[PDB]
Design a binder for this molecule. Structure first.
Ligand SMILES: [Ca+2]
Lengths: 53, 104
């Protein structure tokens, strides 16, 4: 299976450029998935969807 | 390329340096770049500064003369900064947050 966890971060975390984001999805049992990315140096208006990790 | 303006009996007063990205380069955030220059007694670093009211002077559609003061607005070129004039940019990247990408 593949499934997408959807999070709206607009007011909660302030993801401007050059910003490190760290985290995990932790299940009831078993090993966590590790989220780890740094947002790009430049965001362009021609490319509103970005691949982060 | 580099080009420059001579005031009579004085010497070169101002210079304009034309810059472009290399093939395949990822986009460069011009407003963080620093320019180091050496000459007969001084080694100076200059930092980006905004054109009048806008991030980059929009001359995508041509300039009568790059050195005429009233057209071009040289005034923010202080002794410690530079300003950027956008000469070709399809995607509006220069014009908006000052990012050079392919073909600019
Ligand atoms: Ca561009």
């Amino acid at each position: 299976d593949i499934v997408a966890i959807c999070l709206n971060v607009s007011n909660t975390l302030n993801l401007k450029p050059r910003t490190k984001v760290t985290g995990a999805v932790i299940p009831e049992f078993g090993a966590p998935a590790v989220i780890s990315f740094t947002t790009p140096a430049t965001y362009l208006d021609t490319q509103h969807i970005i691949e982060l990790q | 390329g580099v080009t420059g303006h001579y005031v009579k009996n004085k010497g070169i007063d101002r210079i304009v340096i034309y810059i472009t990205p290399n093939a395949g380069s990822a986009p460069i955030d011009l407003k963080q770049c620093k320019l180091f220059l050496m000459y007969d007694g001084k080694a100076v670093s200059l930092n980006f500064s905004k054109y009048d009211t806008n991030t980059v002077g929009d001359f995508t559609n041509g300039i009568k003369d790059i050195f005429n003061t009233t057209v071009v607005k040289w005034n923010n070129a202080d002794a410690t900064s530079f300003v950027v004039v956008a000469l070709q940019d399809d995607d509006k990247s220069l014009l908006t947050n000052a990012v050079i990408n392919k073909g600019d």
